[PDB]
Amino acid sequence: ARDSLREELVITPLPSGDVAATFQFRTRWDSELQREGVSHYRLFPKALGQLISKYSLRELHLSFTQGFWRTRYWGPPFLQAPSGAELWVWFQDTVTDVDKSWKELSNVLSGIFCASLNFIDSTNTVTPTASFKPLGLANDTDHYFLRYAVLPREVVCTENLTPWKKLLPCSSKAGLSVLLKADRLFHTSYHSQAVHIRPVCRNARCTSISWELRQTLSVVFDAFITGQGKKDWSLFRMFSRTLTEPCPLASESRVYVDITTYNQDNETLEVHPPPTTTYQDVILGTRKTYAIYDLLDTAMINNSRNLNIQLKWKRPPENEAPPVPFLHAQRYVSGYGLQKGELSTLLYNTHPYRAFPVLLLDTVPWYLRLYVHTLTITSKGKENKPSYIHYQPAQDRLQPHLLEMLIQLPANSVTKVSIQFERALLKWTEYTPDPNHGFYVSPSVLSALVPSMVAAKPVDWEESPLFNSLFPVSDGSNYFVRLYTEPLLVNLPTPDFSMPYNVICLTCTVVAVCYGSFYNLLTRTFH
């Protein structure tokens, strides 16, 4: 029909010995979802399909990760998202009230995905000046219509996996969505549940608009937690279920297994079932190759030939692993008391030939009063003046600090951007039910064009696998990456919650003793 579905599972053995699995469920609809009158839905979920017309959306990206992608020890991810719930949306030009529509959309998404996106308020919401460019077709990125919020302390469980799975056409009943057992997906060191809606063109010549819904699920299986042994990395081991019949709705249903060694140009990884074919491509920076298992192939998977892809992989010797992915960050909190500290985020450029620009976005939730005159960017032991600096200050309880900087990372080097903050004392009815746990500083965003080891080719988003069409590649010799640092646990000074009534009496008693002393002096005549 007009709409098509393609599901894909990419298995990447990580350099640290872990194994990452990414599920992609791309639905493309050649329909006019931006306006009303599309009341008839077949593969594109009705719940998400109504949102585009109701609230004038252009792109909707909502992710529900637990964990933190260790870029240093794992590789660069196909798609990373911050811990907690991330939601950024581009609205259409014809909205005229962006914050009201943003509030309504956040509430509706909280209803759909059973998350606390109703907590997205003006204190969490941020308008990046130019960080989260639209991922689909854009006439002009205005950024007046871009909203971005993140809730770092937003748990993801099968509480959010069930609504997420309900939106799939083969709703966890056949095809590639049968490997989505919750107890196996959450037995992991990283879990992502992103949903992306974006204007993608209809054909080879992008002259019309067709809406694409990607439901991605990135998961990383720890070697010591899940494997801890000499058994192969089978689909059964990691998902407790093999692959039965494919999704009949899917136009293409494939499993990609990364079989790529380093310091070696042959001797790929060993996969037990002979794959359909092999797809070699420059994916992020390196020419890596995959074994393909086409589920829409009765030779590969019969009605009684369930597929259990096995992968022989263990943490390679240190003289056989990729060095580091040319860019990683590490955010932390300096100081040790209350009332004062520093938000510092180291960001590394391990390429020993090429400086590259990096866009750092920081959101600080207005109870860590930032002092922007203390913002330093060393980058060599010298001082590195950012190419572009934007800073919106925070109004207490109504707006967060936003800090966007274009730092040119010089060489193989560590850039230490730090900024001092002072912890605020809040009202007693302003702390969470667990006030002594602390508050979360949202993970900082790090958008860069990292240089690639080998130059990529311009490839259409239809022939290419689903993991190679997340970001609209622009240069070719540089690939775009968006890192997220860790969420920061910052403790605030706390008032004594058990004494709100004694304090009133005591302070009013001090006022009263002053009043009595001045009364007994301004009215009492000496005698």
């Binding site: 759909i112 130019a130 302390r153 509480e159 997906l185 002259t207 969470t432 039910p433 622009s474």
Partner: protein, 330 residues
């Protein structure tokens, strides 16, 4: 024979901190039974003040267990939490019952019950005399709960209501009810407060409250087409089994409990009419993706950072009057 049509359910866990795993397990056991017996997720307003289902401290992620044998995961593969974490407040709870929720609230986060609706309300957590602690911070009292139930009845937002509470001294949370069709269960009586504590060696914290555990065991043996009645659930937990005395309350229900099926609140047996009627109808230029990091463009989008200086108007204005005061005195 009951007249209800809807069969909603509100299940609440007012507890955090992963050592209250027993309360999340109570709520999820009632939820599992209710969802197995028929009530859809859209008609269940589930509240879990903390996940404890796959928080990092869980030895078995994405599971909540009822028994040490770990053979019945009440937190199954099909579960939806409408209110969780800091959203589960006494304010939000009373908003859901009384309908006074903020207008942006979606359908799934509200109790859209009508005059033909049977409602099951299950509250679990620390609870003292005629009061239930919400996440160790705030309070709901039996006065407020009775007032909310009366407000529900005024608008005819329920046909019959079954209230179940599994807290300490829980028979006094339903001691101030006046709304016409409510029958209430409780784990313990006005006085007993002894709280059981037998932590599972495998899962560090306690599993259940031993009352809803037997309610779960009672509800596991029935099918959607079961004729078991409220009189068979009024003695599901004897004094020999749960240390506390589970006391019910039928002073409001018009219908005899021996005729009220347990599927009338746990599960949704829909009235079915076979339809026999029939209507007899007549019978150019390309588009570009955005540049993710336009380094040249975003530098020039901002006016050049120049060192600030006060305007000439202020300096001239201030300096002129400083001299002016120097001349009135001199």
């Amino acid at each position: 024979r009951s007249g209800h049509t809807n069969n909603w359910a509100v299940l609440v866990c007012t507890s955090r901190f992963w050592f209250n795993y027993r309360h999340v397990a109570n709520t999820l056991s009632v939820y599992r039974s209710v969802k197995r017996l028929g009530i859809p997720d859209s008609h269940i307003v589930l509240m879990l003040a903390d996940d404890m289902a796959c928080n990092p401290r869980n030895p078995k992620p994405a599971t909540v267990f009822s028994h040490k044998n770990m053979e019945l995961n009440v937190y199954g593969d099909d579960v939806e939490v409408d209110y969780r974490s800091y959203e589960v407040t006494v304010e939000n709870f009373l908003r859901v019952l009384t309908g006074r929720i903020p207008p942006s609230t979606p359908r799934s986060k509200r109790l859209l019950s009508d005059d033909r609706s049977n409602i099951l309300i299950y509250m679990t957590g620390h609870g003292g005399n005629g009061f239930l602690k919400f996440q160790d911070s705030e309070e709901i009292t039996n006065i407020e709960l009775a007032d909310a139930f009366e407000q529900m009845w005024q608008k005819r937002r329920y046909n019959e209501l079954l209230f179940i509470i599994d807290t300490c001294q829980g028979a006094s949370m339903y001691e101030r009810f006046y709304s016409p069709n409510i029958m209430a269960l409780a784990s313990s009586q006005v006085g007993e407060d002894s709280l059981s504590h037998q932590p599972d060696p495998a899962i560090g914290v306690h599993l259940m409250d031993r009352y809803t555990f037997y309610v779960l065991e009672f509800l596991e043996e029935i099918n959607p087409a079961s004729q078991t009645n409220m009189n068979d659930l009024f003695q599901v937990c004897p004094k020999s089994l749960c240390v506390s005395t589970p006391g019910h309350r039928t002073d409001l229900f018009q219908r005899d409990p021996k005729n009220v099926l347990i599927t009338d609140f746990f599960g949704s047996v829909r009235k079915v009419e076979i339809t026999t009627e029939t209507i007899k109808l007549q019978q150019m230029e390309p588009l570009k993706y955005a540049e993710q990091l336009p380094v040249a463009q975003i530098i020039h989008q901002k006016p050049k950072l120049k060192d600030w200086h006060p305007p000439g108007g202020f300096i001239l204005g201030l300096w002129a009057l400083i001299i002016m005061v120097f001349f009135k005195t001199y």
